Design a protein around this ligand. Structure first.
Ligand SMILES: [Ca+2]
Length: 314
């Protein structure tokens, strides 16, 4: 995938028993040269790095001081945690989307930071504040958090996002600004069709002509009482309809469950999917029942059955 490159690597041959600093919530991964990077929710957007994808070490944060413009959109925010970053690589630039919000409310904005490289040793390393991308107010029926960028097969970038309210949203981005046009249409593409509407954390990939929408159902952020699960549906067209294995639209609660956790890893969710040659990984967090519900990075090989549906190995 040009915007999520992983060079050669065969994820299916690797030993994904992770080690090191593995606290993480809402993680994404990028690889640049020999170095791997995790970005995740936390103060100023937290960063981890690794030489091999398996041994992780904490590596600072993106914003030491938060941009003043956040207060124009979320004036009640009064701590420095930024949520649910998303990374892609295009035209030589790293695009890091992220969420500014307060828990329980949809007064929210997705921001964009860019860098020429992810390696802080390089002289060109500098996370630049490129401002707001899309926002929600309490008058809106969506929540501007949880960004994901995908480029469709034809090279058009799209932003999916959303959490609760009317559900998952989709909007085209322009290739040069990597922001939506001011008159771009906002499309709703998935919903539980329940109240409250516990769907969030979209991630779209394309494989063999189909777009796969991965989402998280149910509740994060409750330690061992979290009920997150990962669900998926697919569509031949980026704009939908996304449908699950049973033919049920993701706008009416459809979604095939990929992982609902177990008695050791609770509430797995907020996932990302990456490819390398013919292999793939699922990245997510899960709440550790043996360690006070602490959210923990998980990376697992992701397989694809003969009808194209993803599945985890055992
Ligand atoms: Ca995400």
């Amino acid at each position: 995938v040009h915007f999520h490159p992983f060079g050669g690597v065969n994820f299916y041959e690797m030993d994904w028993s992770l080690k090191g600093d593995l606290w993480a919530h809402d993680p994404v991964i990028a690889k640049e040269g020999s170095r791997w990077y995790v970005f995740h929710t936390g103060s100023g957007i937290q960063i981890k790095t690794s030489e091999d994808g398996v041994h992780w070490e904490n590596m600072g944060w993106v914003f030491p001081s938060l941009p003043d413009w956040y207060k124009q959109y979320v004036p009640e925010k009064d701590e420095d945690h930024l949520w649910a970053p998303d990374i892609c690589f295009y035209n030589g630039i790293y695009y890091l989307y992220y969420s500014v919000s307060t828990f329980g409310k949809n007064t929210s904005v997705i921001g964009l930071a860019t860098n020429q490289t992810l390696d802080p040793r390089d002289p060109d390393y500098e996370w630049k504040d490129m401002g707001p991308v899309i926002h929600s107010t309490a008058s809106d029926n969506y929540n501007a958090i949880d960004p994901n960028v995908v480029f469709d097969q034809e090279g058009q970038p799209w932003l999916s996002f959303g959490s609760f309210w009317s559900g998952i949203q989709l909007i085209q981005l322009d290739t040069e600004t990597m922001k939506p046009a001011a008159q771009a249409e906002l499309l709703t593409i998935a919903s539980r069709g329940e109240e409250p509407n516990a769907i969030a954390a979209p991630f779209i990939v394309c494989r063999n002509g189909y777009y796969y929408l991965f989402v998280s159902f149910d509740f994060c952020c409750r330690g061992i009482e979290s009920t997150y699960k990962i669900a998926v549906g697919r569509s031949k067209d980026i704009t939908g309809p996304y449908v699950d294995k049973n033919g049920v639209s993701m706008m009416q609660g459809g979604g095939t469950i990929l992982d609902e956790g177990n008695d050791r890893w609770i509430g797995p969710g907020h996932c990302a999917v990456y490819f390398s040659g013919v292999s793939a990984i699922l990245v997510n967090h899960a709440y550790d029942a043996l360690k006070n519900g602490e959210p923990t990075l998980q990376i697992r090989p992701l397989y694809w059955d003969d009808e194209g549906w993803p599945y985890l190995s055992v």
